[PDB]
Ligand binder design. Structure first.
Ligand SMILES: *[C@H](O)[C@H](CC(C)C)NC(=O)[C@H](CC(C)C)NC(=O)[C@H](CC(C)C)NC(=O)OCc1ccccc1
Ligand SMILES: *[C@H](O)[C@H](CC(C)C)NC(=O)[C@H](CC(C)C)NC(=O)[C@H](CC(C)C)NC(=O)OCc1ccccc1
Ligand SMILES: [Cl-]
Ligand code: NA
Lengths: 301, 305
């Protein structure tokens, strides 16, 4: 029993983290096989942070301009290429610690673990979710760029996020490992702002099911709702629409608890209307939306 | 910016986890040098778990009764002994992945990372605190026994917890790596309960400092209090007493933010007596007490391991 925000063990990723320095900028890179992936803005200077021409900056670089350090070992760069907003540095040695891995681009509402790193060394590991507005709510300081997000279902590391930037509300933006930003952001210091964020409804429902699995029922009620009436109410609290895909996805947790999905929607409706009246659910006084249905099944079963 | 419940990187510990099987019970062990440590109740039967005489149950056991698997490799047990509630299985091979480590016993209010494991395979990592009632609010399923808690201090892993059991409220109990239970618990399936818990005051104060450092300031006020006055409020609201040593420990955060501890205590006093008036702090509608002062300084300064 118990329910915690649980990250994947980070050791398979720790063994991939390196430090990349170009000029006076240092950040982190991800060393897989004979390639180091990092944010391409490591090649910016303080003059071209607003409108960098990355193609023009990179053609001027020599391999020896990139200083890549893996623990105490300098790696030798022997070539390079840019893919969207990620730089791929070819090195003369393959990482002997390369795990089984893949690259996946995730959808809003998905969760992943972040291994926050500075100067190529790990600081800690935590769980995040891709918000509906394509930001994440991380914990990142100066130097954290190139830190990655990942899942490790089974024995394979799925890399889904590389950190690039912080926006004015203190939230974070980045790319997949093919260098495509999540959301409309660009790796330029021109004014940008995250959209109004919303709550990941399907994830809240999953967590309410987790609460029932863990022995709590105080928030249930005798009512039900149609899907459309649920979405008309949830709208008014800045909740994301619940789709029929989401209802299907909750089917297994529904079967395990005996609570029909639309009956759980009626419970959520009442919680939005009433609040918790001094009670908690799974140790929280707010409705939690950074556990997916898959996460709940992973941790409870 | 940002502030998250953050665990230590777990790689040094992942290389130490093994599977231990005795009879029909399988749980986890910790392989360090040429010893595997695991809960002694691995030796208990389905027919005999209510009032075990562990002394007597182990002499019947011999070495090849314990099946130890590191990944897909069997380790040969060559000796066995008991220390308090932990079994020590001597194996024929030293763990080549043994990190720099030590065994430590922590105090209530201290936090640590838990590497939850099943069948010798790490499955997840999360941050916990030793509650004042000596339980932890973990997440553990059948087969999780022998999962370990730890901190990292520079390059050294400090192991502080091994998981043994679940209490009726859904909270968890275990031992240090010398086999001493935390709390007034015993390793048998007799009636036991967690005591009434309290809130870890010095940790709440640390988390309020983290909030200020991240720009959440609405709860600050002009007032100050004294240690004596605040501790009466703390007692009243089932908060742990605040000692002068706690005040000194928070000193750094006090200097950095310009809010003296007794200044911040007057904020916490007001949040206890009046509540949050609908607002949140660092994304929480409750007062969070599982960040230590060290945890806050570490995360807010980017310390690495
Ligand atoms: C890499 O380690 C670092 C991580 C941050 C968490 C500090 N990223 C950057 O420095 C990044 C480089 C640019 C070229 C992508 N810049 C930012 O993240 C920057 C904030 C820094 C200076 C603290 N954000 C930014 O420029 O956002 C756009 C913007 C500009 C002006 C007004 C609003 C928004
Ligand atoms: C080890 O994998 C496992 C971890 C649990 C989280 C499943 N530990 C046990 O099975 C443990 C062994 C005993 C000898 C300490 N037993 C328990 O933890 C047990 C709950 C299990 C069956 C889920 N709880 C227990 O013994 O609590 C005391 C108790 C018993 C009966 C009535 C009141 C209190
Ligand atoms: Cl996805
Ligand atoms: Na004050």
């Amino acid at each position: 029993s118990g329910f915690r925000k649980m990250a994947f063990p980070s050791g398979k990723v720790e063994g991939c983290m390196v430090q990349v320095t170009c000029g006076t900028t240092t950040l982190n890179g991800l060393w897989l096989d004979d390639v180091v992936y990092c944010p391409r803005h490591v090649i910016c200077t303080s003059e071209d942070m607003l409108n960098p021409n990355y193609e023009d900056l990179l053609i001027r670089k020599s391999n020896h301009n990139f200083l890549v350090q893996a623990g105490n070992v300098q790696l030798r760069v022997i070539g390079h290429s840019m893919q969207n907003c990620v730089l791929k540095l070819k090195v003369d040695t393959a990482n002997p610690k390369t795990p089984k891995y893949k690259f996946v681009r995730i959808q809003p509402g998905q969760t992943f673990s972040v291994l926050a790193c500075y100067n190529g060394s790990p600081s800690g590991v935590y769980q995040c979710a891709m918000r509906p507005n394509f930001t994440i709510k991380g914990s990142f300081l100066n130097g954290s760029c190139g830190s990655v997000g990942f899942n490790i279902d089974y024995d394979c590391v799925s890399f889904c996020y590389m950190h690039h930037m912080e926006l004015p509300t203190g939230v974070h933006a980045g790319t997949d490992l093919e260098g495509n930003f999540y959301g409309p952001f660009v790796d330029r210091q021109t004014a940008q702002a995250a959209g109004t964020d919303t709550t990941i409804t399907v994830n809240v429902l999953a967590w309410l099911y987790a609460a029932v699995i863990n022995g709590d029922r105080w928030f249930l009620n005798r009512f039900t709702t149609t899907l459309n009436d649920f979405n008309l109410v949830a709208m008014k609290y800045n909740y994301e629409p619940l789709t029929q895909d989401h209802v299907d996805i909750l089917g297994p947790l529904s079967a395990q608890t005996g609570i029909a999905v639309l009956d759980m929607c009626a419970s959520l409706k009442e919680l939005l209307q009433n609040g918790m009246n001094g009670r908690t659910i799974l140790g929280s006084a707010l409705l939690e939306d950074e556990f997916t249905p898959f996460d709940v099944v992973r941790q409870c079963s």
